[PDB]
Amino acid sequence: ASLTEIEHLVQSVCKSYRETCQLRLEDLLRQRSNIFSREEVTGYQRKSMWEMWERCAHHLTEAIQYVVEFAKRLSGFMELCQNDQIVLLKAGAMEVVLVRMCRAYNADNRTVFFEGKYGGMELFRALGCSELISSIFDFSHSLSALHFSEDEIALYTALVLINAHRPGLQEKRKVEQLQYNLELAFHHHLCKTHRQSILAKLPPKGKLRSLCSQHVERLQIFQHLHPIVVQAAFPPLYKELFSGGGEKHKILHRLLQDS
Ligand SMILES: CCn1c2ccc(OC(C)C)cc2c2cc(C(=O)NCc3ccc(S(=O)(=O)CC)cc3)ccc21
């Protein structure tokens, strides 16, 4: 590429991210005073393990849906082959969400936006996966300290998705070319903005992997306890990405072709 082509890539990635923002950053910020009452938090903790999982899995899926749209509007993604498009989303959708999640996290009070209001990590006690939950909270605390801008979120999440070491890619070099061009864009924007210093403070990719593996390990435990809840009440797309052998659902392909 070239300088103008790189800056055009910066604007195109940032646009594609805004359009597929689930919630505008301002909407999330204006709600920061709206905090679950102690009584409301007690009600969350007393809900059954399997209903909490169903509600959270459904919210997770909604977020995942916006990440698919981001991909479809992202330069070069839709020129990749369908096998590679699915490998990328299958492995990176949960990662993009975990990163996007820091916009919904308030480090002042350590709360996360969820079902209309902000609550701390006790809100999630009914799930029986406190390690996962505190890892995600801590992970969102780390990212919140860097004070990402929205533009920086878009460029960074683009790279989280366009990761050419995902196993199973058929056109690895084509994904390499794309990844390298988004890296230059990201780094060009940080340099231009005097923000290269965040580069040494980004999470190792091994960390995003770790959280996703914890996600799936805890899903398998829950599914073994409530197999019929998963079969009858989890979102199909969620089963496709995360459960086993749940990928008999072909939702992603449907999503990727539907205009
Ligand atoms: C660690 C605590 N936590 C969860 C823990 C587990 C879990 O699912 C498992 C049960 C499978 C799901 C959640 C979960 C979901 C939300 C959520 O969706 N809030 C609504 C929202 C809407 C838009 C944005 S955004 O615009 O910033 C783009 C992402 C952010 C947030 C918040 C916290 C959560």
UniProtKB/Swiss-Prot annotation:
Induction profile: Up-regulated in the state of obesity.
Tissue: Isoform 1 is widely expressed in many tissues, including liver and adipose, and highly expressed in skeletal muscle. Isoform 2 is primarily expressed in immature thymocytes.
Domain NR LBD: residue ranges: 5-243
UniProt effect for mutating residue 133 to N: Nearly abolishes transcriptional activity
Residue numbers covered by motif AF-2: 237-242
Subcellular location: Nucleus
Known disease link: Immunodeficiency 42: An autosomal recessive primary immunodeficiency characterized by increased susceptibility to concomitant candidiasis and mycobacteriosis. Candidiasis is characterized by persistent and/or recurrent infections of the skin, nails and mucous membranes caused by organisms of the genus Candida. Mycobacteriosis is characterized by infections caused by moderately virulent mycobacterial species, such as Bacillus Calmette-Guerin (BCG) vaccine, environmental non-tuberculous mycobacteria, and by the more virulent Mycobacterium tuberculosis.
Function: Nuclear receptor that binds DNA as a monomer to ROR response elements (RORE) containing a single core motif half-site 5'-AGGTCA-3' preceded by a short A-T-rich sequence. Key regulator of cellular differentiation, immunity, peripheral circadian rhythm as well as lipid, steroid, xenobiotics and glucose metabolism. Considered to have intrinsic transcriptional activity, have some natural ligands like oxysterols that act as agonists (25-hydroxycholesterol) or inverse agonists (7-oxygenated sterols), enhancing or repressing the transcriptional activity, respectively.
Domain notes: The AF-2 (activation function-2) motif is required for recruiting coregulators containing LXXLL motifs such as NCOA1 and NCOA2.
Subunit relationships: Interacts (via AF-2 motif) with the coactivator NCOA2 (via LXXLL motif). Interacts with the corepressor NCOR1. Interacts with CRY1. Interacts (via AF-2 motif) with the coactivators NCOA1 and PPARGC1A (via LXXLL motif). Interacts (via AF-2 motif) with PROX1. Interacts with FOXP3. Interacts with NR0B2.
Family: Belongs to the nuclear hormone receptor family. NR1 subfamily.
Annotated protein name in UniProt: Nuclear receptor ROR-gamma
Lineage: Eukaryota, Metazoa, Chordata, Craniata, Vertebrata
Gene label: RORC
Shown stretch of the complete protein: 265 to 507 of 518
